[PDB]
């Protein structure tokens, strides 16, 4: 569905005929369609569509509930593979925080007590 | 950058 502008917003044209948007609630103007907040990715890493990748299929069973089918590997799983993938990203970053922090603290405990070997 | 940033019209332009 094509959203209408939010209440208080108005589409306008500048002296050159370029479209811009007027926000009457905040008495401001913008080149940015305020509907872009819902339809454009937030960053270059974001993706608005949640559609599953090639070969994956959402499925349902009255006892198990929602689950997922991977036609690529001929397997099924309960966990959302999108969530799984994100968490494996997250886990790799967190593992590094822990490893790096431990390394840095060990390096500093050594550097210190070279003058406190005593 | 070689193109200058163009700001939108101020609030309250002619209708």
Numbering used by the authors:
A (entry chain A): 4 to 121
B (entry chain C): 277 to 291
Task: Provide the authors' own sentences about this structure as they appear in the paper.
WW domains organize molecular assemblies by binding to short, proline rich peptide motifs each with ~4–6 residues. The type I WW domains bind to a consensus ‘PPxY’ motif (where P is proline, x is any amino acid and Y is tyrosine, also known as PY-motif) with very modest affinities (with Kd in the range of a few to a few tens of µM). To achieve this goal, we determined the high resolustion structures of 7 representative WW tandem/target complexes, and measured the binding constants of >100 WW domain tandems or isolated WW domains binding to known or previously unknown targets. In this study, we discovered that WW tandems, but not individual WW domains, can bind to target proteins with extremely high affinity and with very high sequence specificity.
We found that the last canonical PY-motif of AMOT (the ‘PPEY’-motif, named as PY3 in the literature) is preceded with an ‘LMRY’-motif, and these two motifs are only separated with two residues (and we define these two motifs as ‘PY34’ from hereon). Unexpectedly, the KIBRA WW tandem binds to AMOT PY34 with a high affinity (Kd ~96 nM), although the PY3 sequence severely deviates from the canonical WW domain binding PY-motif of ‘PPxY’. We solved the high-resolution crystal structures of KIBRA WW tandems in complex with PTPN14 PY12, AMOT PY34 and LATS1 PY23. The interactions between WW2 and the first PY-motif are more variable, as their sequences can significantly deviate from the optimal ‘PPxY’-motif (e.g. AMOT’s 1st PY motif has an unusual ‘LMRY’ sequence). Correspondingly, KIBRA WW2 has an Ile (I81) instead of a highly conserved Trp at the end of the β3-strand (e.g. W34 in WW1). The Leu and Met in the PY3-motif of AMOT form hydrophobic interaction with I81 and Y70 from WW2. This explains why KIBRA WW2 can accommodate non-‘ΨPxY’ motif sequences, as long as the two residues corresponding to ‘Ψ’ and ‘P’ are hydrophobic. A residue in the PY-motif linker (R440 in PTPN14, Q282 in AMOT and G553 in LATS) uses its carbonyl group to form a hydrogen-bond with the sidechain of Trp34. The C-terminal extension of PTPN14 and that of AMOT form additional hydrophobic and charge-charge interactions with the WW1 domain. All these interactions contribute to the bindings of PTPN14 and AMOT to KIBRA WW tandem.
